[PDB]
């Protein structure tokens, strides 16, 4: 974010397990998965000021 090295090299060291809607072991699902998914998908491409 401050140094988007990952997004440059195209890797993922710490960003594939941030929120609950991410890939979990053995394809289980954290609760509120769909709510989190929909929030993220709505907040995509508009910014945090509009998303609020």
């Amino acid at each position: 974010p401050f140094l988007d090295i990952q997004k440059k090299l195209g890797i993922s060291l710490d960003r594939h397990f941030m929120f609950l809607s991410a890939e979990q072991p053995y394809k289980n699902a954290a609760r509120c998965h769909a709510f989190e998914k929909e929030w993220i998908e709505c907040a995509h491409g508009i910014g945090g000021t509009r998303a609020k």
Partner: protein, 120 residues
Amino acid sequence: MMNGRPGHEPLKFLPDEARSLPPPKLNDPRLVYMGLLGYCTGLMDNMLRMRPVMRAGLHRQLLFVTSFVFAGYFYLKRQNYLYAVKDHDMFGYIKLHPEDFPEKEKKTYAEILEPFHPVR
């Protein structure tokens, strides 16, 4: 603030959209002032280490000058790109939202009534 703009490439110095800008002259005052910084740097280096100034390490001074002018040229291309993108964004936003950026429709001093403040 411009970091989150569309097309922002993370850790990109010259995004290849800047190749439409007029590149900077090499005799630009900024570059030939960076050159003076390099020369004065060579001079101060010779001074601190107790060496003759203007006659010692002529290769070192040339190297300083070249490096300074080089960094200057490229950093300056980048800054030009940045200011141009700023103007681009501004004018685009103004075109998109005109009602928030309307015309002035200014009157002439025949219709204006400015007060008179004497000096007495």
